[PDB]
Homo-oligomer: A and B are copies of this chain.
């Protein structure tokens, strides 16, 4: 595993990790922007003959050396531009991409906006609705935001509290600092930027969409409807909002099999 940094001319110094050789698979974090959540799966995926790349997102965790623009008023289109910048820097010309949440919005924006660069995209639980209870955290003090959201992650949406806690004290210390950054920059601007307003733009595209099997139906009901309308492959992964944490082996298998399917089709 390569663990290093790279600077892009939009002012971001990225923390990234890379393992393996072969076709590129890129794992984009959820809004919390913490790529240690992929640690187990990166090795499993790479071992199947892929070069796997992941990174902390701008302003989050180890990628905190970034201009304010990159972690405030954040949109799917901004995030897509940033991911393209690090792919450019790492000379990754053509990639399979995974993303959950704001990461899901990001990878659909990547597929639509940069089609030459993207072999196929896997999106999981893509937020398309403003949620006032999340947006309202943006005006609270840092410590209260961190306490509220850490509890939401642990008890409401992790999909496996034991696995969530087992990320470890170091990860949760980074997450502690990320929660206010995410709260201020993401929930008010990410959902209206969802690149799924044009259903016909999705039709025929190499997109595989998932929702957590244990997620309450109302949370991403709209994903299932939109995917079905567009004829896009839609299915379930075990757990909820973080399958790469709750069920890393199932997650890795899904990423490998889906990438293999598209390598067969493209040939």
Task: Using CB atoms and an 8 Å cutoff, list the residues of chain A in contact with chain B.
Answer: 211-221, 224-225, 228-229, 234, 236
Residue of B218, B234, B236 near A214 (CB, 8 A) is B218
A236 and B219 CA atoms in complex are apart in Å by 11
A220 and B217 CA atoms in complex are apart in Å by 8
A229 and B218 CA atoms in complex are apart in Å by 19
A236 and B228 CA atoms in complex are apart in Å by 17
Cross-chain contact A236 with B213 (CB below 8 angstroms)? no
Using CB atoms, name the residue of chain B closest to A220: B217
Cross-chain contact A217 with B225 (CB below 8 angstroms)? no
A214 and B220 CA atoms in complex are apart in Å by 11
Residue of B215, B225, B228, B234 near A216 (CB, 8 A) is B215
List 8 tightest A-B contacts by C-beta distance, closest first.
A213-B218, A228-B228, A224-B224, A215-B217, A217-B217, A214-B216, A225-B228, A211-B217
When distances are taken between beta carbons in the complex, the residues of chain B under 8 Å from A228 are: 224-225, 228-229
When distances are taken between beta carbons in the complex, the residues of chain B under 8 Å from A225 are: 224, 228, 234
Using CB atoms, name the residue of chain B closest to A224: B224
Given contacts A212-B217, A213-B218, A221-B236, 4 further A-B contacts (CB under 8 A): A211-B221, A215-B216, A217-B224, A224-B224
When distances are taken between beta carbons in the complex, the residues of chain B under 8 Å from A234 are: 225
A228 and B229 CA atoms in complex are apart in Å by 7
Task: Provide a sorted-by-A list of 14 A–B residue pairs whose CB atoms are within 8 angstroms.
Answer: A212-B217, A213-B217, A214-B216, A214-B217, A215-B216, A215-B217, A216-B217, A217-B220, A217-B224, A217-B236, A224-B225, A225-B228, A228-B228, A228-B229
Cross-chain contact B218 with A221 (CB below 8 angstroms)? no
Using CB atoms, name the residue of chain B closest to A234: B225
A237 CB, min distance to chain B CBs, angstroms:
10
Cross-chain contact A216 with B218 (CB below 8 angstroms)? no
A104 CB, min distance to chain B CBs, angstroms:
15
Using CB atoms, name the residue of chain B closest to A211: B217
A211 and B217 CA atoms in complex are apart in Å by 8
When distances are taken between beta carbons in the complex, the residues of chain B under 8 Å from A219 are: 217
When distances are taken between beta carbons in the complex, the residues of chain B under 8 Å from A229 are: 228
When distances are taken between beta carbons in the complex, the residues of chain B under 8 Å from A213 are: 216-218
Which of A218, A219, A229, A236 has the largest count of B CB atoms less than 10 A from its CB? Answer: A218
Residue of B212, B214, B216, B221 near A224 (CB, 8 A) is B221
